[PDB]
Design a protein around this ligand. Structure first.
Ligand SMILES: *[C@@H]1O[C@H](CO)[C@@H](O)[C@H](O)[C@H]1NC(C)=O
Ligand SMILES: *[C@@H]1O[C@H](CO)[C@@H](O)[C@H](O)[C@H]1NC(C)=O
Ligand SMILES: *[C@@H]1O[C@H](CO)[C@@H](O)[C@H](O)[C@H]1NC(C)=O
Ligand SMILES: *[C@@H]1O[C@H](CO)[C@@H](O)[C@H](O)[C@H]1NC(C)=O
Ligand SMILES: *[C@@H]1O[C@H](CO)[C@@H](O)[C@H](O)[C@H]1NC(C)=O
Ligand SMILES: *[C@@H]1O[C@H](CO)[C@@H](O)[C@H](O)[C@H]1NC(C)=O
Ligand SMILES: *[C@@H]1O[C@H](CO)[C@@H](O)[C@H](O)[C@H]1NC(C)=O
Ligand SMILES: *[C@@H]1O[C@H](CO)[C@@H](O)[C@H](O)[C@H]1NC(C)=O
Ligand SMILES: *[C@@H]1O[C@H](CO)[C@@H](O)[C@H](O)[C@H]1NC(C)=O
Ligand SMILES: *[C@@H]1O[C@H](CO)[C@@H](O)[C@H](O)[C@H]1NC(C)=O
Lengths: 320, 211, 116
């Protein structure tokens, strides 16, 4: 009502003749708003036990200081998370277009992420299926190597090389993201598209839709009733139609986001809480393990994979 | 059976489908009472009271308003149809992977380690019963990556080395069941000098007590 | 200005209500608690922590609790726990249980047809 008629009594009364469209519009937008909290629920709240990060960030040569929370920061985010957040209203409010807060705040999401990381490092994937069963990190890796068809002795005899390759690979992540503004464009785009939708809806109020004036009070003061009703009817139809268009587009976009949230939830379960055997599902190469990070309106996964190198030609035979 | 009985909300997803379609039709009917700027919502009253050149104009208003109500209904049904199609596709996938096989996908076929599943019929949908294995009552053991014997590093073939406190044993990971460390339960690769955390323990050779 | 929402338990149990003034300041509206979602009046805010019942926003949920009244609190995320993290010991299960869980999925809608 506010969007269409503002504070104009004559319009507010006339608007009642066009049925229950305003009710339907609220019905659709309310459904979307609720779903947006559910989508977050499904991705992050996969653990009923909230674990505390370990006192140390260095395990058997493996440095996790870039993925674990940095205590020197007021927000207690990790070095990588802080970068992700750093790269990624009255005009609308005054037209009856408002914004509702999320149920889970950034701090709450951070706690879920920390619990998942603490579990992954100290208990591997046992906390996902059942109780958190402690294991030495180097031994967790040994099992992850067996899982890709590589005998565990390969890890133990090359622990220093592997730890070094890992540590370097992680450091490069912060540099890659920092130097690549487009890296988080995928989350940027969602924000931009929704902002445009609201701005378009507001500008449409300036359209006359064939009416003598875009302003309802600038009609009743000049025109006789039967004449004003024609001009007002045009304005109501145009503005109501604009709301219908807005909602339709939001329902379609919501469907796309829901699908993305479902994929993220699947990856959390299969990449973070276990080891995947699905090709290119948890990154290119042979999946070993993954670590979640928080981000604006989404989630970021760090995928650690094993890649073969320096092949040699040998003669072979099917049998001896 | 008791869980489903005591918690009616369990089947809310199926009831929601019924409720949404029921509401859509009731809303569509109510719209007929709207006037959309016409003198009356009744077509016969407009034609009976007003002359042709005016009656047609107000009829045009009712026709337009009613066409837009029908278009709204259909659009909403197309969107909801997509939501259900996705659910049906997932249900069909689970049937193939959870019921007609055994899944290795984490939390895909219930919480814990998937053993098997059974389908059940339901109104406008399907219900799955997921049977899973859950570990319980864990105990702390001392461990090592390898055993050193005769200058050689011995690794477990399909298990983990543990120490009940003083003796070394090799066992499976998912269920404590200690066995003597021998030469048909381990493999040898490399010497004792490149394995960090390696411990000294005699490896049993089952052939020598006989010879 | 702002929206006005009514928070209530089912009328089969209680007729008590609390009112939320969305985006409104508690000194603007004229058991008064100010949250990021607006001003909540009629609910008693407590420093306890429970599972979320009727969500309001910004980490705050309301519930009907024991004599009986509507209360507001910061929602629990999960049970607080801690995982052992040694470099020389492993935990191994000595027993197990068999569990059965249910999963419910929609497959189809009611089919309709309209005579335009
Ligand atoms: C882990 O890496 C950080 C740099 O990101 C470094 O400052 C820290 O000292 C490293 N930890 C150890 C034990 O060397
Ligand atoms: C192996 O032989 C192929 C030709 O059959 C050649 O193209 C390839 O470069 C060789 N690779 C190596 C590592 O020698
Ligand atoms: C195993 O060790 C952890 C860490 O000290 C302890 O919290 C847990 O209760 C122990 N469990 C058993 C069965 O000793
Ligand atoms: C560990 O196992 C050995 C088997 O030879 C047994 O003699 C010993 O008493 C056991 N120790 C404990 C604490 O159970
Ligand atoms: C395990 O950690 C302790 C410190 O608590 C250290 O002294 C010991 O050398 C470590 N063991 C291995 C194999 O690194
Ligand atoms: C194993 O025995 C060698 C002597 O052959 C000794 O130098 C080494 O320290 C011993 N290791 C352990 C863990 O007892
Ligand atoms: C209302 O409460 C009674 C218990 O006093 C219960 O038996 C009944 O099923 C409830 N009805 C609804 C709709 O919750
Ligand atoms: C509500 O009013 C108080 C008192 O003026 C002020 O301190 C507080 O910041 C205001 N909050 C909001 C959201 O306006
Ligand atoms: C919660 O505790 C704080 C002290 O940290 C106190 O000031 C506040 O009034 C308490 N609120 C309630 C509802 O008890
Ligand atoms: C395992 O738990 C069952 C109860 O479900 C109990 O009867 C059995 O004795 C336990 N076995 C062991 C080794 O604790």
């Amino acid at each position: 009502t506010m969007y269409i008629c503002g504070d104009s009594t004559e319009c507010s009364n006339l608007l009642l003749q066009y049925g229950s469209f305003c009710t339907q519009l609220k019905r659709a937008l309310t459904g979307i708003a609720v779903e947006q909290d559910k989508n977050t629920q499904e991705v992050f709240a996969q653990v009923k036990q909230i674990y505390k990060t370990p006192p140390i960030k260095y395990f058997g040569g493996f440095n996790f200081s870039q993925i674990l929370p940095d205590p020197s920061k007021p927000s207690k985010r990790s070095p990588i998370e802080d970068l992700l957040f750093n790269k990624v209203i009255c005009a609308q409010k005054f037209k009856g277009l408002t914004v509702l807060p999320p149920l889970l705040t950034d701090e709450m999401i951070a706690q879920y992420t920390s619990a998942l990381l603490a579990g992954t490092i100290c208990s591997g994937w046992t906390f996902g299926a059942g109780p958190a069963l402690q294991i030495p990190f180097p031994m967790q890796m040994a099992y992850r190597f067996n899982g890709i068809g590589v005998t565990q002795n390969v890890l133990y005899e090359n622990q220093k090389l592997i730890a070094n390759q890992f540590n370097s690979a992680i450091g490069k992540i912060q540099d890659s993201l920092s130097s690549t503004p487009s890296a988080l464009g995928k989350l940027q785009d969602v924000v931009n598209h929704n902002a445009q939708a609201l701005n378009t809806l507001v500008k449409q109020l300036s359209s006359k839709f064939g009416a003598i004036s875009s302003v309802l009070n600038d009609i009743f003061s000049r025109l006789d009733k039967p004449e004003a009703e024609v001009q007002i009817d045009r304005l109501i139809t145009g503005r109501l139609q604009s709301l219908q268009t807005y909602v339709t587009q939001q329902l379609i976009r919501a469907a796309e986001i829901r699908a993305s949230a479902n994929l993220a939830a699947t990856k959390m379960s299969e990449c973070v809480l276990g080891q995947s055997k699905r090709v290119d599902f948890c990154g290119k190469g042979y999946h070993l393990m993954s670590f979640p990070q928080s981000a604006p309106h989404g989630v970021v996964f760090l995928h650690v994979t094993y890649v073969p190198a320096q092949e040699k030609n040998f003669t072979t035979a099917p049998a001896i | 059976q008791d869980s489903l009985s005591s918690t009616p909300s369990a089947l809310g997803k199926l009831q929601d489908v019924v409720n949404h379609n029921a509401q859509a039709l009731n809303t569509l009917v109510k719209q007929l009472s709207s006037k959309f700027g016409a003198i009356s919502s009744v077509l016969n009253d407009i034609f009976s009271r007003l002359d042709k050149p005016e009656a047609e104009v107000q009829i045009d208003r009712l026709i337009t308003g009613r066409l837009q109500s029908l278009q709204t209904y259909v659009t909403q049904q197309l969107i909801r149809a997509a939501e259900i199609r996705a659910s049906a596709n997932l249900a069909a996938t689970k049937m193939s992977e959870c019921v007609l096989g055994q899944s290795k996908r984490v939390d895909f076929c219930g919480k814990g380690y998937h053993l098997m599943s059974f389908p059940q019929s339901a109104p406008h949908g399907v219900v799955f019963l997921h049977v899973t294995y859950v570990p319980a009552q864990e105990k702390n053991f001392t461990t090592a990556p390898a055993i050193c014997h005769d200058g050689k590093a011995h690794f477990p073939r399909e298990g983990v080395f543990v120490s009940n406190g003083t003796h070394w044993f090799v066992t499976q990971r998912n269920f404590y069941e200690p066995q003597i460390i021998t030469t048909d339960n381990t493999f040898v690769s490399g010497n004792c000098d490149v394995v960090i955390g390696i411990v000294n323990n005699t490896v049993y050779d089952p052939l020598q007590p006989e010879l | 200005f702002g929206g006005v929402s009514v928070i209530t338990p089912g009328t089969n149990t209680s007729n008590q209500v609390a009112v939320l003034y969305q985006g409104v300041n508690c000194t603007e509206v004229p058991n008064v608690f100010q949250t990021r979602a607006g001003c909540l009046i009629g609910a008693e805010y407590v420093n306890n922590s429970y599972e979320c019942d009727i969500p309001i926003g910004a980490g705050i949920c309301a519930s009907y609790q024991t004599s009986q009244s509507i209360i507001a609190y910061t929602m629990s995320l999960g049970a607080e726990n801690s995982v052992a993290c040694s470099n020389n010991s492993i935990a191994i299960p000595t027993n197990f249980t068999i569990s059965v869980t249910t999963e419910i999925l929609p497959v189809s809608m009611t089919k309709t047809s309209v005579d335009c």
